[PDB]
Amino acid sequence: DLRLVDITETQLDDVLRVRARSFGLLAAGAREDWVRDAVEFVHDGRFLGVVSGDEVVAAARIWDFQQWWGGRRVPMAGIAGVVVAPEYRGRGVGSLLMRGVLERSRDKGMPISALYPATTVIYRHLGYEFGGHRYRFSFQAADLRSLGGREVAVRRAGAKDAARFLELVGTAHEASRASGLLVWPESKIAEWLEDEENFAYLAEDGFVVYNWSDGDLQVDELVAHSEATARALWATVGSGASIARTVHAYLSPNDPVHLLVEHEADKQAHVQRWMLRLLDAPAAIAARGFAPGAAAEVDLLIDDPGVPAQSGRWHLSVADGTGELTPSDRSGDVLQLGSRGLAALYAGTPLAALRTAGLVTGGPVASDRLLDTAFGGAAPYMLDYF
Amino acid sequence: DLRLVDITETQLDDVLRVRARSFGLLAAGAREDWVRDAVEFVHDGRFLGVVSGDEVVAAARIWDFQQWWGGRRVPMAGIAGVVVAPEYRGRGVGSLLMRGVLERSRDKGMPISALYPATTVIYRHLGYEFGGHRYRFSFQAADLRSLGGREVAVRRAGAKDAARFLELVGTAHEASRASGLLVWPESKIAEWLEDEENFAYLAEDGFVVYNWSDGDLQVDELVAHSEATARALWATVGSGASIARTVHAYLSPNDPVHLLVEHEADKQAHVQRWMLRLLDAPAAIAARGFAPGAAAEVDLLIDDPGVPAQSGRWHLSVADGTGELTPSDRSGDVLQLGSRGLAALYAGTPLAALRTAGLVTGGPVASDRLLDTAFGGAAPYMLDYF
Amino acid sequence: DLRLVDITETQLDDVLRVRARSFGLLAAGAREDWVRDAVEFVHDGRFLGVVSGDEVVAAARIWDFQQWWGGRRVPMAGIAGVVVAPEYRGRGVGSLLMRGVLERSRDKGMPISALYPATTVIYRHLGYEFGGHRYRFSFQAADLRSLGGREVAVRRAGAKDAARFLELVGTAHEASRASGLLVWPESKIAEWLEDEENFAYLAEDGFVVYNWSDGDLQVDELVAHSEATARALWATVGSGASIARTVHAYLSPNDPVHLLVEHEADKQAHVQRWMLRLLDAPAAIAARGFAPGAAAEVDLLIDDPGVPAQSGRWHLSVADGTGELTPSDRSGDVLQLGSRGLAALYAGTPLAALRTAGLVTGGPVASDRLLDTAFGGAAPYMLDYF
Amino acid sequence: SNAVTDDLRLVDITETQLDDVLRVRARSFGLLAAGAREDWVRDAVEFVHDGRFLGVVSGDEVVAAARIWDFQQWWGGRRVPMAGIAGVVVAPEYRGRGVGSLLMRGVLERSRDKGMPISALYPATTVIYRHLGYEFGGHRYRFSFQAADLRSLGGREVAVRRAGAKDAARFLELVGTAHEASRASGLLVWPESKIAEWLEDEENFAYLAEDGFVVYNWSDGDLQVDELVAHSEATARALWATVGSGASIARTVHAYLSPNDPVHLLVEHEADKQAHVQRWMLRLLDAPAAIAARGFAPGAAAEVDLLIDDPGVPAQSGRWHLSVADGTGELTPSDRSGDVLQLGSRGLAALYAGTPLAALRTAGLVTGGPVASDRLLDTAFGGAAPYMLDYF
Ligand SMILES: CC(C)(COP(=O)(O)OP(=O)(O)OC[C@H]1O[C@@H](n2cnc3c(N)ncnc32)[C@H](OP(=O)(O)O)[C@@H]1OP(=O)(O)O)[C@@H](O)C(=O)NCCC(=O)NCCS
C-alpha cells in the first residue's frame, strides 16, 4: 500500500512530524530555516518521500553536490535527512525510499552518492561503503596567535567574495589532487559568508572562516597557498586567545598546520566516517582524477544487483591522470567486486583491506598493485557534515 | 664541566633521580623492572648521558628497532626516556645529549631515527619532523562478538609462538606494503607473550593480543589474512562483552575492521604523532620500499647542518619498487629541503603541505608529482608508544 | 494580620512573584502556560493563598485527582506548587496555608491527599507520610528494538484517542489491582496527546507515550494487555536506536519489560517518594480495594489532632475485596496510630517497619498479620511527578 | 577452540587446578591483586573439598569453571537451602560453543544432588541463564543519605558497644528474630564461620545493642552500611546515629537495605533520588521441596493446580496441586486434566519469588488457566518484596 512520491511544499508539515520523531525537535526559529531550505529541494526534484494512503511516512533529500576526486570535480548526490515514521520502521520502507533516491540520483546524472549514516546496515545493503573521514583537531589559541605572517594583508570578507573563495579552493585542490571535499553552489557559499555568526577573512592567496563553539573558536575551513599566508590566517583566528583558549579545526591529518604550530593538537580528536556508492561506474571513472604517472590496464568484474547497468565485466584503462572504463570480453582470472568494494576501491581504500573485509575476491596480485597506485594519493576527507 | 658519556650500571640510580623529576615517580615494583630493561641498553652502548662533575645530569636511551617503510624493514634508532635535571634545563644540555644520541645512532649504522616528543621545539631544532600517527579507536564489545567466525580454529598462544607471530606479521606488512610499524626483536615478543597480563590467540592465518584497560579491553595488535579469521579474532576479543562494554584498539584508520563491524568506532578517538629523522639519507633510500609502478628521476638539494655528510645536491632514482640516492653536480632550479622536510618527504607527507609549511622550497612543479607518487602508499602509522 | 484566602485571577501575578522566589524563574513562554493552568484552579475553588494585608504571601494548588488503591479509584487531593515568600518563611505561614488546604480538600469530599515534598518536616507535622515511589529505569534502545511483535497493528494516536487510553488503563489496573497510580481527567489526557512533543501509539490492547529527553528517549507510560503487544510497543520506542542509544522509562519494578529485554536496566536508577495522608478514614477505607481472599476484623485506636473527626477507637472489617471502618465499643489492648502511621498502613507499609519507626504502638501481634495481608498487594507507585 | 582435538568434559576442580582456574578468571573478570589472590585460593579450597567447585576441561586444560555457595535463603520468613552460583567463567576461545551451558547443567545437577531445592545468582548476561531456566527473582538496593541527618536521630540512652568475631552467633539470632517477624524474603543466610570472618575484618566496623546491630565501612570518603538490624525505635535511632557520628568527615552514608526499611520514615532528608537497583535470578531445582520449606502469607489459603514444563529438571515436570493454608504449603501430583495455569522454569521461579501473575502473563512466562487461579496464587506467594543485602 506504500507509494514513493516527490515531496511537495504542502507535505513539509508532515515531513517535519516524521523528522521530530526521528532526530529530535526543532526550535521555532530553526524550523523556519528548515522549511526555507526544503523549498529548493522540492522544486528541483530532490525531495523524495513514501506515502501510506495520503500520509507522508518517510522522506529523504538529495544535495546537488560536486565532490573532489584526485583533483577533479565529480557530480555527487549527497543524501540527507533520511527519516521514517516510528510505526513504519523495520518493514522495508526506508529501503523502498532509498531505492527511489538512488534511481532519482541516476536520472539527474550524478555518477556517485555520499552520506553520513546513522546506522550502517541499511546503506550497506544498498551498496554504500565507508569512503573517507572528517577530522576535528584541537589546538591552543595562544600557539596560533604567535605564528606570524604579520606582513600579509588580511581583510574581513563577505557575501561578495564568494566567487573569489571558490577560485582559491579550486586552485588549491587541483594542485594537491585532493579527494573527498564537497563543492557547494556559489549561492550556498554566499549564504555562509553572509551569516553574521561566521567570521570570514580573505588574503590574496588564502582565506579562513571560523565561529564560536561554546567559548572556544572553531575553524570551518582554512585555505592558504603560501607559508606567510597560512601563518597570517591562523594568527588571525588565534588572535582571540585572550578569551578563547582552544581552537578546534576541521581539516586533514596532512594539513600543514601540524607542521607549523609549536604544541601538537590534543590527543583527543574527532574522527567521523562518510559512505560512498557508485551509481554510474564509467561516468565516475571518466570524471575522476588519477595519480600522476600511474598506468593501469586492468579488468574488473562488477556485481551490482542494485544497479544492474554497471554489472558485468569491464576494462579499466588509466594513463596520464585520466581513466576510462569500457566493456571487456576477456576470460582470465579477474578481480570481482560488489557495490561496496567498488565504492571503497574508487575512494582509494587499499586492496589488502578490501580482501580481508571480503568485499573483493579473485584476481592476480599483480593487478592489485596497479589498482592500488592508480587510485592512490591523498586520503579522502571532508570538512562538512550533512 | 659538561661531558657526554656512556651511562654505566652504577649510574642508573642517578638516572632514576633525574627521571623522577622529569616524568614522575616509579612504584617500588616498576623501579626494579626499569633497572632490568636498562642494563641491556648499557651493555650495547645504547644509553647516553651527560655528567656535571661526577653527577648524571641528563640521559636518553636508543632502541635498536627496525621500522617498516613501503613494505621493507629499515633499521631505526628509537629514542626514549629523554630527561634533563630541572636545574640544568634551558641551558643546551638536552641538545648536547641529543647530538650525542644522533652521533651514536649513526655509528651503529641506523639510517633513520624516530621518537614521540613531549615538546617539539628541541627535536625540530635537531632536524626531526612529524612522520606518522598512532590511532586508538573504541568499539562496542557486543558488536565485535557478533562478527562470528566461530568455525575458525583458534588457540591460546604463548611465548613459544613468537616466531610464528613474526612470520604472520611479515607476510601481512609485505603484502600491504606497510609503513611506520615497529619491528621488535623475537626476544621482546616472547616476553610480551609470556606476560600473564597479555591475552594472545593464534589462528592458522592470524593472531590477536589484548589485555584489560580499566574495565575495558584493549587490543594491542590484531593481524588477519582472511575475513573468516578477522571475524574469529575480533569475536574472541568481543566475547568478553558481558563484562567489558568497550574494546579500544590500536590500528590504522584503513583497518578492515571498520568495514566489518555494524557500529562505527566512537567519534572520540586518540590520535598521537611521532617524529622521524634521516641520519644517512642514501642508506635510508636504498632500504625503503617504493610504490609499485612508481618511477622518478629527480634532483634534491639537502641542507642539513646537523649531518653535513648528507648535505649537497643528490639525484633520486626510483624504479621497480627500489630507489637510489647518488651525488649530483647538476645546476639550475632544484627542490631544496632541510632535515625536517627530508624526513617528512620520506614519510610520505605531500609536497603541497611541505611547501605551505615552508619546509621545502624551490624546484619545478613537475618534480613534485613524481616525488609524491614515489613516496606514496599507505599512511604511516605505529601500534606502539615508546 | 495573616489571613487565608481563595486566590483570585488578579492575584496570580503576585503568586508568580512568590513562585519565582521559591522554585526559580519561568520563561516568558512557560509563564503564559502557567496562567492558563492556574485559571481552572481558581474557578473550581482549588487555589488557596495567605495574604498579609494586600499582598499574597503564600499559595498552594489542589489537583482533582483520583488514585488507584487495590484496583479501585479513590478521590484524591493532589497538593502542588506550595510556595511561601522568603521573608514570611519560618513563621508558621506554610502550616497555616496547608491546614487551609486540608480543610478545603475535605470540604470537597476527598478522603485522601498526596504530594511530593521538597522538605519532609512541614508535611510530617501536618500528618503526611511516605506512601509510595516513582521509578525511572534506563534500557538500551537496541535491545528494545529487537523485541518483535511485528504482527501487531500499531498506529499513531492523538487527542481523539483519549477515551480509549482511559479504557485500556482501567482494564489493566483492575486486573492487577494496582495502587498508587494517578487518574487524570480525560481533559488533561487530551492535552497530553495533543502535545506534538509527545509521541503516542495505540494498539488493540495497549499504548505507549514517549518523547525526547536530551538525546535519549523517555517513556511516560506503556500499557499492554498481552505479550505480543508489549513487544510491539517497546519495539516502536526502540526503533529510534540509530539516534537514541538509551530509553528511560517510568514504570514499576514489577513491570514485565524486565522479564523481556536481554540487557538488564542500568544499575543507576531514579527512585522518588511521594507522601500520603488520610482526610476521611472511613470513606478512604470504604473506597479502597482489598487483596483477594483477605479477611480481617481488628480494632484501631487513631490519634489524629489534625483531623479530630478521624480520631477515636475504630473497627476495621475486611472481607471479599471491600472494607469498612466503624466506631468501636470494645475496650482492651489495641494498635495505636497517628495520622502518619495511618496513612502508611493504608499505603501498604508493613507493620514491622511502622513499629520500628515508632509510627504505631501497642496491640497484639495477631492483629498485625491481619492488617499486613489486608493492606498487602502490589507496591504502590506513580508514573507522574506533580 | 579446536573441535578436531577438543575433548570437552565436566569435572570436579581439584586444588592443583586452581592456578588454571585463575587464568580463566583473569581473562573473564580481570586481574587479581597479589593480596586478593591469596584470599581467593584459600576460599577456593573450601569449595574444592566440599564438592562445590565444578569445571570443564579439554584434555587436561581447564577451559571453564563455576562454584556453588552453600547458602540458605529466606522465603516468607523461613530458611530455604540454596545453591548460590558464583565465578562462572569460560576461556575466551571456548565461549559461544556450548561450554558454559555444559558447565551450568553440571552445576544444577551437583546442586540437586546436594539437596538444595533452589538456586540463585547475579547474572552478567541473562541469555545463558534464562535458557537454563533462571529468571529475575528480586533486587538489591543501595540508597544514599546525608550523614549529618543520621547523626541527630537520637537514642543516646541505648547501650551500643563495639562488636567482633565472637558476636557472630548473636548477630544470627538478631537477624533471625527480625526476618521471622517480618516474613522477609530474598535475604542470604551465611555460615556462622563466614560471619565471624566478616566481623574480624579490621575494615568492617560492627556495633551491637541489646536488640540490634550495624556493620559499616569506608567507601571512597563516604560510609557504607552493609547491614543494619533493629527491633526497636530507640535502637534503630542509636545505630543510625552511630554511623552518622562520622559526619564531620563523611558527608554521605550509602546503605544497602529494602525500600521498605524504617529509616526512610525516620530521617529528615529523603534518600538521594539516584539509587542503585541490581537484580538477582532464581531457579527452582526441586519444586515440592522448595514449596514445603517456604513460608506463606498469614491467612492466605489456596488450592490450585500448576502444570510445570521443565525439561531441565524432569522430576519437577508435570501436573501438580498446590495446597496453601495457615502459613504452610504443599505441592503434590495431580491426575486432573482440565484447564490449568502452565509455566516453564522461568515462570515457576518468578511466581515463587512473588512476581505478579499479570506481569508473568504479559511476559509470556505463564500461559492458560482460569483467572480465579491467578488471584489465589497472587496472595499465597504475596508478602514483602524479596531483596538481598549482599552481592556474590
Ligand atoms: C559464561 C559465559 C557468559 C557464557 O558461556 P558460553 O560458553 O559463552 O555460553 P554458551 O553455552 O556457548 O551459550 C549459551 C547461550 O548464551 C548466549 N551468550 C553467551 N554469551 C553471551 C553474551 N555475552 N551476550 C549474549 N548472549 C550470550 C549464547 O548465544 P550465541 O553466542 O550462541 O549466539 C547462547 O544462546 P543461544 O545462541 O542458544 O540463544 C561466557 O561467555 C563467559 O565466560 N563470558 C565472560 C565472563 C562472564 O561474563 N562471566 C560471568 C557470567 S555470570
PDB file of C-alpha atoms and ligand atoms in Angstrom, chain B residues 142 145 150 238-243, chain C residues 262-263, chain D residues 24 27-29 87-92 94-103 121-125 127-129 131, ligand 1:
ATOM      1  CA  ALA B 142      28.882  -6.718  21.806  1.00  0.00           C
ATOM      2  CA  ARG B 145      31.224 -10.500  19.452  1.00  0.00           C
ATOM      3  CA  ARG B 150      33.428 -19.368  15.360  1.00  0.00           C
ATOM      4  CA  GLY B 238      34.384  -9.247  21.920  1.00  0.00           C
ATOM      5  CA  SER B 239      33.304 -12.463  23.683  1.00  0.00           C
ATOM      6  CA  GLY B 240      34.040 -10.660  26.954  1.00  0.00           C
ATOM      7  CA  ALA B 241      31.191  -8.221  26.273  1.00  0.00           C
ATOM      8  CA  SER B 242      29.236  -9.446  29.281  1.00  0.00           C
ATOM      9  CA  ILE B 243      31.887  -7.736  31.438  1.00  0.00           C
TER      10      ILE B 243
ATOM     11  CA  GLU C 262      18.105  -9.095  27.115  1.00  0.00           C
ATOM     12  CA  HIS C 263      20.123  -6.413  28.940  1.00  0.00           C
TER      13      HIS C 263
ATOM     14  CA  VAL D  24      40.472 -18.362  33.001  1.00  0.00           C
ATOM     15  CA  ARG D  27      40.628 -13.413  31.088  1.00  0.00           C
ATOM     16  CA  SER D  28      36.992 -13.182  32.238  1.00  0.00           C
ATOM     17  CA  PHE D  29      36.746 -10.672  35.107  1.00  0.00           C
ATOM     18  CA  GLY D  87      32.511 -17.108  39.477  1.00  0.00           C
ATOM     19  CA  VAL D  88      31.057 -18.501  36.254  1.00  0.00           C
ATOM     20  CA  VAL D  89      33.949 -18.235  33.738  1.00  0.00           C
ATOM     21  CA  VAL D  90      34.776 -19.681  30.294  1.00  0.00           C
ATOM     22  CA  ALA D  91      38.118 -19.178  28.458  1.00  0.00           C
ATOM     23  CA  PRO D  92      37.692 -16.657  25.578  1.00  0.00           C
ATOM     24  CA  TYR D  94      35.936 -21.527  24.211  1.00  0.00           C
ATOM     25  CA  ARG D  95      32.914 -19.175  24.518  1.00  0.00           C
ATOM     26  CA  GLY D  96      29.851 -19.362  22.244  1.00  0.00           C
ATOM     27  CA  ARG D  97      30.293 -23.110  21.764  1.00  0.00           C
ATOM     28  CA  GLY D  98      28.021 -24.608  24.450  1.00  0.00           C
ATOM     29  CA  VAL D  99      30.736 -24.906  27.131  1.00  0.00           C
ATOM     30  CA  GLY D 100      29.104 -22.569  29.685  1.00  0.00           C
ATOM     31  CA  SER D 101      25.822 -24.465  29.254  1.00  0.00           C
ATOM     32  CA  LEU D 102      27.542 -27.815  29.761  1.00  0.00           C
ATOM     33  CA  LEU D 103      29.178 -26.382  32.901  1.00  0.00           C
ATOM     34  CA  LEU D 121      22.897 -15.844  41.119  1.00  0.00           C
ATOM     35  CA  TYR D 122      23.684 -12.339  39.857  1.00  0.00           C
ATOM     36  CA  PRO D 123      23.987 -12.786  36.072  1.00  0.00           C
ATOM     37  CA  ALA D 124      26.427 -10.759  33.941  1.00  0.00           C
ATOM     38  CA  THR D 125      24.383 -11.726  30.889  1.00  0.00           C
ATOM     39  CA  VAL D 127      20.764 -15.156  27.982  1.00  0.00           C
ATOM     40  CA  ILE D 128      22.562 -18.318  29.150  1.00  0.00           C
ATOM     41  CA  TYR D 129      20.743 -18.313  32.488  1.00  0.00           C
ATOM     42  CA  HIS D 131      17.950 -20.748  28.625  1.00  0.00           C
TER      43      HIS D 131
HETATM   44  C1  LIG E   1      29.688 -17.711  30.976  1.00  0.00           C
HETATM   45  C2  LIG E   1      29.520 -17.006  29.634  1.00  0.00           C
HETATM   46  C3  LIG E   1      28.899 -15.637  29.859  1.00  0.00           C
HETATM   47  C4  LIG E   1      28.574 -17.833  28.748  1.00  0.00           C
HETATM   48  O1  LIG E   1      29.219 -19.070  28.433  1.00  0.00           O
HETATM   49  P1  LIG E   1      29.317 -19.631  26.932  1.00  0.00           P
HETATM   50  O2  LIG E   1      30.066 -20.946  26.938  1.00  0.00           O
HETATM   51  O3  LIG E   1      29.769 -18.497  26.058  1.00  0.00           O
HETATM   52  O4  LIG E   1      27.763 -19.907  26.622  1.00  0.00           O
HETATM   53  P2  LIG E   1      27.144 -20.987  25.618  1.00  0.00           P
HETATM   54  O5  LIG E   1      26.795 -22.198  26.470  1.00  0.00           O
HETATM   55  O6  LIG E   1      28.001 -21.210  24.404  1.00  0.00           O
HETATM   56  O7  LIG E   1      25.836 -20.204  25.120  1.00  0.00           O
HETATM   57  C5  LIG E   1      24.662 -20.163  25.924  1.00  0.00           C
HETATM   58  C6  LIG E   1      23.746 -19.078  25.366  1.00  0.00           C
HETATM   59  O8  LIG E   1      24.171 -17.799  25.851  1.00  0.00           O
HETATM   60  C7  LIG E   1      24.440 -16.899  24.766  1.00  0.00           C
HETATM   61  N1  LIG E   1      25.539 -15.985  25.168  1.00  0.00           N
HETATM   62  C8  LIG E   1      26.722 -16.308  25.730  1.00  0.00           C
HETATM   63  N2  LIG E   1      27.416 -15.167  25.975  1.00  0.00           N
HETATM   64  C9  LIG E   1      26.638 -14.132  25.576  1.00  0.00           C
HETATM   65  C10 LIG E   1      26.810 -12.752  25.572  1.00  0.00           C
HETATM   66  N3  LIG E   1      27.952 -12.192  26.050  1.00  0.00           N
HETATM   67  N4  LIG E   1      25.820 -11.978  25.073  1.00  0.00           N
HETATM   68  C11 LIG E   1      24.677 -12.502  24.595  1.00  0.00           C
HETATM   69  N5  LIG E   1      24.489 -13.830  24.588  1.00  0.00           N
HETATM   70  C12 LIG E   1      25.457 -14.655  25.071  1.00  0.00           C
HETATM   71  C13 LIG E   1      24.732 -17.791  23.581  1.00  0.00           C
HETATM   72  O9  LIG E   1      24.417 -17.107  22.362  1.00  0.00           O
HETATM   73  P3  LIG E   1      25.260 -17.384  20.994  1.00  0.00           P
HETATM   74  O10 LIG E   1      26.654 -16.914  21.314  1.00  0.00           O
HETATM   75  O11 LIG E   1      25.182 -18.875  20.755  1.00  0.00           O
HETATM   76  O12 LIG E   1      24.566 -16.546  19.946  1.00  0.00           O
HETATM   77  C14 LIG E   1      23.799 -18.976  23.854  1.00  0.00           C
HETATM   78  O13 LIG E   1      22.466 -18.613  23.479  1.00  0.00           O
HETATM   79  P4  LIG E   1      21.715 -19.061  22.110  1.00  0.00           P
HETATM   80  O14 LIG E   1      22.650 -18.764  20.961  1.00  0.00           O
HETATM   81  O15 LIG E   1      21.427 -20.536  22.307  1.00  0.00           O
HETATM   82  O16 LIG E   1      20.487 -18.177  22.104  1.00  0.00           O
HETATM   83  C15 LIG E   1      30.870 -16.902  28.913  1.00  0.00           C
HETATM   84  O17 LIG E   1      30.624 -16.385  27.604  1.00  0.00           O
HETATM   85  C16 LIG E   1      31.892 -16.034  29.629  1.00  0.00           C
HETATM   86  O18 LIG E   1      32.764 -16.549  30.309  1.00  0.00           O
HETATM   87  N6  LIG E   1      31.834 -14.711  29.491  1.00  0.00           N
HETATM   88  C17 LIG E   1      32.709 -13.700  30.091  1.00  0.00           C
HETATM   89  C18 LIG E   1      32.709 -13.934  31.608  1.00  0.00           C
HETATM   90  C19 LIG E   1      31.399 -13.678  32.316  1.00  0.00           C
HETATM   91  O19 LIG E   1      30.613 -12.803  31.970  1.00  0.00           O
HETATM   92  N7  LIG E   1      31.148 -14.457  33.363  1.00  0.00           N
HETATM   93  C20 LIG E   1      30.038 -14.400  34.310  1.00  0.00           C
HETATM   94  C21 LIG E   1      28.674 -14.823  33.815  1.00  0.00           C
HETATM   95  S1  LIG E   1      27.642 -14.538  35.295  1.00  0.00           S
END
